[PDB]
């Protein structure tokens, strides 16, 4: 538990130096579960990068910060935000990463209606990421609209890996209570050993976000919502009359209480609903800079 002991460990795995030596004009754009996010300008080029800053002292579980380094070093992908370099800056871990200038999906689902071509495009992109992550043993454990970032051209990428975990033949299940209340899988809230299926449940909840604008039981306090996820039947859309039977059938393979019966990322990529998926250009008009 020594802060300065943990600073020393982090120092051995991160890149040397201080990125303020080549970055200008830090501006805070977001706040996450483990820290804040800034936009910065690369002095030499004028390009923009993102900088996640995470205070070692504010972490509940300091050792999860290594997830940021583990993902950066070994699991890059088309639909995963790219991480360039990590630094120890005083008491903070800084990750210089790709700037997803179109913002988070949350700003879209809370201010406009997505049609199913856009929803299917989001789901397809997120499922391509998860099928590759799951195949290599990596569980995200914090899937929600806040964790889905967009390019200005509508490309969709997975972000915020600060809570992920690895499984393998020697460690086939995780047991940690991790995630965001309204999005957590039932077996996770039940403290059962779980695997990649919890990401599939969380994506189902995010589908409900895109249809309803908010996850189920969002008006209830977080602990009450978790008990209702644990004990009640799968949460239903508030607007079932507004989803095509194709979308409802997709969602039904997602929000299955028995994780053995839940569809996997690999299976879901074959579902007919994803044939509705539009190109990234179809997400562009949803973003704040382009809405009315």
């Amino acid at each position: 538990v020594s802060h300065e002991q943990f600073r020393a460990a982090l120092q051995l795995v991160v890149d040397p130096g201080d990125p303020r030596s080549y970055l200008d004009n830090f501006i805070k754009i977001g706040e996450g579960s483990t820290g804040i996010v800034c936009i910065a300008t690369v002095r030499s080029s004028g390009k923009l990068v993102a900088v996640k800053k995470m205070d070692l002292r504010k972490q509940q579980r300091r050792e999860l910060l290594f997830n940021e380094v583990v993902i950066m070093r070994d699991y890059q992908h088309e639909n995963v935000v790219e991480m360039y370099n990590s630094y120890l800056v005083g008491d903070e871990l800084w990750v210089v990463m790709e700037f997803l200038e179109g913002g988070a999906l949350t700003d879209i689902v809370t201010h406009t209606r997505m049609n199913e071509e856009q929803i299917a495009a989001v789901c397809l992109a997120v499922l391509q990421a998860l099928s590759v992550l799951h195949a290599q043993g990596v569980i995200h454990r914090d899937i929600k609209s806040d964790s889905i970032l967009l390019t200005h051209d509508g490309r969709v990428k997975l972000s915020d890996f600060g809570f992920c975990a690895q499984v393998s033949k020697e460690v086939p299940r995780r047991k940690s209570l991790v995630g965001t209340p309204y999005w957590m899988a039932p077996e996770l809230i039940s403290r059962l050993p779980y695997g990649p299926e919890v990401d599939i449940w969380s994506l189902g909840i995010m589908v409900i976000e895109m249809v309803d604008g908010e996850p189920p039981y969002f008006n209830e306090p977080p602990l009450k919502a978790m008990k209702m996820i644990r004990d009640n039947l799968p949460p239903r859309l508030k607007n079932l009359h507004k989803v095509s039977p194709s979308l409802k059938g997709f969602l039904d393979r997602l929000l299955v209480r028995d994780p053995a019966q839940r569809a996997t990322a690999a299976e879901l990529l074959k579902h007919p609903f994803l044939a509705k998926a539009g190109p990234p250009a179809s997400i562009v008009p949803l973003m704040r800079q382009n809405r009315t």
């Binding site: 579960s33 509940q60 949350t106 914090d142 809570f163 991790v178 995630g179 209340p181 977080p222």
Partner: peptide
């Protein structure tokens, strides 16, 4: 609250 635990 959209805050992760």
């Amino acid at each position: 609250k959209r805050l992760s635990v």
